[PDB]
């Protein structure tokens, strides 16, 4: 059953990939809103987390290619726009939490299909999702508990995420 094992892993890898593509767009939308509001540090860290999901999306596609499949290019679920700051961190924490639940199941399938390399990929990525979760939880906890005295400190901070995107041009 070589082919069935391959096919079954590719299916969860494409499920996870589509979840990554949704998070990229969702986090970046919130990044545009945070920058607009001039809350630099929140905006910078939101983009940096979106870049992590980009890297997750890339790794899932590379493994899908190694297994003979085709990486999906459609995002899972819909992006929510116009979210308020308190809503941003509460939904993002919920979404990371849900992501770690789904990936843990995906991990299950990989082990069931005797795929150690893909299982380890999900294991590695779950640890990074956990860092995202803690991040969004903490911010959400400060927002709830301290409100505007917390935000006054973020106002006007730098939004820079480092040297610009090394690209082609």
The answer to whether 12 touches 99, Cβ cutoff 8 Å, is no
Q: How far is the CB of 6 from a second copy (least distance, A)?
A: 8
Residue 165 binds: one of Fe ion, a second copy, none (C-beta under 5 to 8 A by kind)? none
Residue 18 and residue 73: Cα distance in Å, rounded?
7
Q: How far is the CB of 73 from a second copy (least distance, A)?
A: 22
Residue 51 and residue 101: Cα distance in Å, rounded?
21
Given 56, 75, 89, 143, the residue binding Fe ion (CB under 5 A): 56
**In the chain, count of helices (H) and strands (E)?**
5, 0
Tokens linked to 85: 């700051």
Contacts with a second copy by CB under 8 A lie at 1-4, 6-7
Angle at 100 between CA 94 and CA 101, to 5 degrees: 90
Name which of 6 and 75 has its Cβ closer to a second copy.
6
Name which of 38 and 62 has its Cβ closer to Fe ion.
62
**Does 17 participate in binding Fe ion (rule CB under 5 A)?**
no
Name which of 1 and 165 has its Cβ closer to a second copy.
1
Name which of 1 and 149 has its Cβ closer to a second copy.
1
Angle at 133 between CA 61 and CA 115, to 5 degrees: 35
Q: Which residue has the tokens 């911010």?
A: 139
Contact segment (CB under 5 A) with Fe ion among 38-46, 58-66, 129-137, 150-158 equals 129-137
Q: How far is the CB of 54 from Fe ion (least distance, A)?
A: 9
Residue 5 and residue 119: Cα distance in Å, rounded?
13
Residue 105 and residue 79: Cα distance in Å, rounded?
23
Contact segment (CB under 5 A) with Fe ion among 17-25, 29-37, 100-108, 147-155 equals 17-25
Tokens linked to 90: 């509460």
Given 22, 47, 75, 132, the residue binding Fe ion (CB under 5 A): 132
Residues forming contacts to Fe ion in the complex (CB under 5 A) are 20, 53, 56, 129, 132
């Amino acid at each position: 059953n070589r082919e069935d094992r391959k096919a079954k892993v590719i299916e969860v890898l494409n499920k996870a990939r589509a979840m990554e593509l949704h998070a990229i767009h969702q986090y970046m939308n919130q990044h545009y809103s945070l920058d607009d509001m001039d809350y630099g540090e929140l905006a910078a860290n939101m983009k940096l987390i979106a870049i992590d999901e980009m890297r997750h999306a890339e790794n899932f596609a590379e493994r899908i290619k190694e297994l003979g499949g085709e990486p999906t290019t459609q995002k899972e679920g819909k992006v929510v726009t116009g979210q308020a700051v308190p809503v941003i961190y509460e939904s993002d924490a919920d979404q990371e939490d849900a992501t770690i639940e789904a990936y843990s199941q995906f991990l299950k399938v990989c082990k069931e299909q005797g795929d150690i390399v893909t299982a380890r990929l999900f294991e590695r990525i779950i640890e990074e999702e956990q860092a995202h979760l803690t991040y969004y939880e903490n911010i959400g906890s400060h927002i709830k508990n301290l409100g505007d005295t917390y935000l006054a400190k973020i106002a006007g901070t730098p939004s820079s995420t480092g040297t610009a995107s090394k690209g082609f041009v």
